[PDB]
Subunit: 403 residues, 3 copies
């Protein structure tokens, strides 16, 4: 196409010894053969600049898991091609002009034993570096045993090895149990993506450093995470629009010295935000929280098994700043668990030194804006409700009621 | 170019039977013919993955309105090509090496009866999905009768039918009366664009859900809007730089449970931000506001028809949190309207439970940091000025002055 | 490649008379001949729409400085190709599968007489407009005399003329004393870049207007800046992840009515943020600051020569809002200068009417959350620590202790 052997068009690649195989019939095999060509020509630690794999708009079945074990590989389409399969599966589509996602459209038809469409994994040194996924659709096609299970065992992109300077951007994920998993992320960017109608959206597993999750649209399933981070340091979550219906919208476990700022959070279940298992010194600020109830008939009765005393925020850690957030709670009294209970907006489950400052709460019912567990120590609650909206079972909580 | 019929180069496409109609002479007609061919080959609701329309950098005249009525259409250039036609039209251009915009440069020369370059509209189901406009320039060429009317009746992109997961990014819009309009937007993304020297910049009309307006440069004209949203829910506005000279910089009519955070606002008129017609449960935080006066001679006498008592923020609605903003007012006494009036910075025009917290105000003349209408109820004002600077005409407002 | 002469592939372009020069041998000489070609075809102020230069993935030497003196020039590649040269230069790389950066990889080998790989400068008129750098790697290859000096005389991109609407996105910069310099920047966007192991990262010099620095990963060298801005007005610095080891992470000199919000800052030295020489009406809000100590052995004894009384924030100017930040200071007591000193988190070195509000400080030792110089006037410190944590040498500081 261009005068480099490092620029690949998947619709122009012939696999030697498998001439009938196309990008349409199995783009996985085609890209595995492309990665082989790259490894045959890039034969030394000083001749490995990587390459780019172009995916034109079109419908491509992936049957073979692609293994990405080369630094500086870029896989690029020209469109995220997102489509609400969830609405399609549940409504009368008679006269509908389109019935599936498109753009640079990869349908994930992987074997159960290698379920992930893209497995980024290198045994050895150094960390895989500078890999870029952008501007194409990853479509799991269907959920089993019906379209509403948010279950099918398929993953879009799974980074298994310690990685450095990976960039995921302009992607479309639909109808995967797991859209994107990154283990061992240093200097990762997950930026300006459409990740919706997946069991789980973005999983930052193991540990991580200096990562940005920015400017994304995300919506997961009732038994799954929207954003999760395990043992992350200086993770920045900014500019994201988290909508339903994951078990949670944000979930840190053992995360310290991260920041969640200028996001929008709409949840249909309690525990939209969870800082778990001792999260220290985290900034949770300039965020809009909205706790509503399911309006899509097919999901009216599905729940995450948590009651309205769980918190919209549930926080177990030291020295977090939960400040300048708006909480708009609207749940029909007959859909609140337990019956007759006041919903808790912010629950400090435990930890030393946490500060709740400058928070506005609206509810359709009498709610406790802040409940502090008895185990909370040296906690401060400032201008986050009248005195009747603050419950401190901890006897050392300094409270300034909103005047 | 690539080995897929779903990739089109506007400079390579010949309209069979019309060898005169080129991308240079009428890029509209070329794109209409390309879309005709997309429809011809993609003739069932399960073979409609869409296409990409590549616009190489150049000067292309658009005479025929393009109608985008296909899902997953990407129209992609290689550069926004922004050029201040406004300075070109008002200073000595002797010796100037360039007098117009460029990049992937579409000159919008549409007839007054089909004035929008791009009409995205589908009478049918479902919602048009996953359309991408990226990395090219829309240039209205001239305002009439002179360069400073911000009037020509032309629109860049007009989404006139309910839509899902549209992506507009890396664009340049210039000298259009309307840059971008999106009716009934769901999961829309207006990201990292240059929308300046247009009568209106981004109008989000009718209703919407789950939209992000992020990381954009935006400057409109005095009878137009910079960003407007009608009846939007869960709209996040973040990381934008709004400069003059729109009638307003942000204008939400009837928007609820939206968020405006981490933006910079510079205007030359009163009412830079307007929450109008019952805006409820919205967060306005972590924003820098600058109210100054017109410095560019050709516009010094121009006004938006509003006095300094309207507010830098004008809010009509319930339970808005206006917090953690810096306000810098610098207007010569002789430019204040009415002459001898104390400028108002934040005006609660009416509504219930609005909270003003932790706002720093600097002004060159004595100003009221907050004014609250007599009709306002359950207002709280905290640490947003000294008592001299807060005026509550309502008797139920709680005020803690800044120490 | 495409059917427009305004689209160039650096691997496909032969230099007339120098048929021995390739993109590999000297990409600077090829790109200069490409710009020669652009200037031969585009020879009037209305036939100058620019061009895109495509850099395929590969290893390219650049011996010859590139002069970019045309509006709407896009230099584009397919990956940022970032690789930690710093870790490589200080560990056993036996059996390392890769030893340099890649993607669209420009090895910058400039002579000291023309040290900047890309000099963007026009001595003519008007201001250079709409130039786009995206999606390639600039790599200075080595520091001298040793890999740990962060010194080599080289610059990636130096914009030396007043400019308008330049866009720097998806870049990788590594091992350059200066990555990006933009003198006189108007409507500049430095968005979504990897700018690391560079003496200086982003230098915004002379003056500036309406600029956004967003969604960037940045790490500089201990005698150089990460983000510097001089006499910038209305600079928005948002969504960035700033890590060590810059002498500073953010440094303003004479910048007014700017905003630093929703950033992550990690420093190893005092003076991570400096608002120098009369900074006014700036917003420092919703940022996470971490002060730690060098953990990387080669740099353990390496310092920026400042002591712990200098400040995590060091502010000289008027009416700044430093609100809603979290500061996490953890420095082994043996590594605190002077010996036995209380580290300063926020130093108001001078200025009138600055306001510190709603700041949570964590430290391992007794800190002063806020020190205000005797030359400070009309300062205000709200809910940013107990009385014992706020030190005012100035007699007129209004202090509300955290309750
Ligand atoms: O200054 C903050 C930084 O300093 C440390 C140094 O280790 O802070 C430790 C810290 O807590 C001590 C410790 O345990 C406590 O842990 C609970 C939360 O994890 C806390 O709520 C309980 O009160 C207490 O049991 O944390 C570590 C585990 O990481 C454990 O080894 C310690 O026992 O000291 C203070 C309590 O006195 C806390 O405010 C602070 O978190 C470092 O962790 C901080 O980064
Ligand atoms: O998109 C540009 C249009 O939007 C505005 C809206 O403010 O921009 C002007 C602009 O300029 C800098 C500055 O001044 C200018 O005025 C001079 C008149 O003598 C002229 O010669 C300069 O070359 C021209 O740039 O604006 C302010 C007030 O005038 C002043 O401080 C400067 O000198 O401001 C924008 C953001 O700073 C820039 O992009 C733009 O250059 C509008 O004026 C334009 O029509
Ligand atoms: O709990 C928040 C939710 O409350 C709804 C309930 O569906 O809003 C209740 C709300 O407003 C009612 C209403 O408001 C107005 O008329 C009042 C006269 O009593 C006047 O005092 C208020 O200032 C004015 O807003 O808004 C809707 C339409 O916009 C209309 O049906 C009503 O007249 O009532 C509370 C007490 O007044 C307010 O705090 C609250 O906003 C729902 O919209 C919210 O999501
Ligand atoms: O190199 C360190 C040695 O240099 C000194 C200067 O003689 O300090 C430089 C330093 O700190 C000065 C400091 O104190 C100043 O203001 C006080 C009243 O406003 C006054 O009593 C002191 O005499 C005066 O030096 O500044 C802050 C207060 O502004 C305070 O924390 C400091 O002690 O300048 C930097 C900050 O501006 C610091 O990094 C540095 O220590 C000497 O004292 C040192 O031994
Ligand atoms: O509305 C504020 C705007 O007005 C300006 C000037 O048009 O600045 C006014 C301002 O600055 C005064 C001045 O300051 C020195 O002033 C004080 C000396 O007593 C000292 O406290 C300050 O540290 C120092 O800045 O600033 C300008 C230029 O720097 C100079 O002409 C003055 O001497 O007046 C107040 C002090 O009374 C300040 O709060 C305010 O900044 C403009 O710069 C503002 O944007
Ligand atoms: O600290 C910032 C600067 O250090 C660089 C090298 O100069 O990278 C270091 C790195 O991490 C620090 C460290 O603790 O991590 C590994 C543990 O596996 C050790 O080698 C180090 O002691 O910091 C980033 C995260 O910001 C990681 O990706 C690196 O490993 C440099 O790139 C940076 O500017
Ligand atoms: O966007 C995904 C989901 O949006 C709505 C509720 O969140 C549902 O129809 C759909 O399943």
């Amino acid at each position: 196409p261009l005068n480099s052997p490092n620029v690949y068009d998947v619709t122009a690649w012939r696999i030697k010894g498998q001439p009938k195989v196309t990008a349409e019939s199995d783009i996985g095999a085609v890209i595995n053969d492309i990665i082989a060509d790259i490894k045959k020509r890039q034969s030394t630690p000083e001749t490995r600049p990587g390459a780019v794999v172009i995916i034109p708009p079109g419908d491509y079945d992936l049957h073979t898991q692609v293994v990405v074990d080369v630094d500086y590989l870029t896989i690029a389409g020209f469109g995220h091609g997102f489509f609400s399969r969830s609405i399609k599966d549940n409504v009368d589509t008679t006269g509908w002009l389109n019935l599936q996602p498109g753009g640079s459209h990869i349908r994930v038809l992987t074997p159960p034993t290698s379920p992930q469409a893209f497995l980024v994994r290198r045994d050895g040194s150094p960390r895989l570096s500078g890999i870029v996924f952008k501007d194409f659709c990853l479509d799991g096609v269907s959920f089993v045993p019906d379209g509403n299970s948010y279950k099918n065992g398929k993953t879009g992109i799974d980074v298994a090895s310690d990685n450095d300077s990976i960039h995921i951007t302009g992607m479309g994920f639909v109808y995967l149990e797991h859209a994107l998993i990154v283990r061992g992320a240093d200097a990762l960017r997950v930026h300006d993506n459409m990740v919706a109608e997946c069991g789980n959206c973005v999983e930052l597993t193991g540990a991580g450093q200096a990562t940005i999750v920015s400017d994304n649209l995300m919506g997961a399933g009732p038994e799954g995470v929207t954003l999760l981070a395990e043992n992350h340091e200086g993770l920045l979550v900014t500019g994201n629009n988290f909508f339903p219906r994951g078990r949670s919208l944000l979930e840190f476990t053992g995360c310290n010295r991260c920041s969640v700022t200028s996001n929008r959070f709409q949840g249909f279940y309690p525990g939209m935000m969870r800082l778990l298992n001792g999260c220290k010194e985290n900034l949770i600020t300039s965020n809009h929280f909205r706790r509503g109830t399911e309006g899509f008939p097919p999901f009216i009765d599905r729940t995450n098994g948590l009651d309205d005393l769980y918190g919209v925020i549930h926080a177990m850690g030291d020295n977090n700043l939960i400040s300048n957030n708006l909480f708009a709670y609207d749940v029909p009294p007959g859909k609140i668990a337990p019956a007759g209970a006041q919903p808790t907006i912010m629950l400090i489950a435990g930890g030393d030194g946490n500060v709740i400052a400058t928070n506005h709460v609206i509810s359709n019912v009498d709610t406790q804006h802040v409940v502090l567990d008895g185990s909370a120590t040296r906690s401060k609650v400032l201008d986050s409700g009248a005195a009747s909206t603050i419950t401190s079972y901890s006897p050392d909580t300094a409270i300034r009621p909103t005047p």
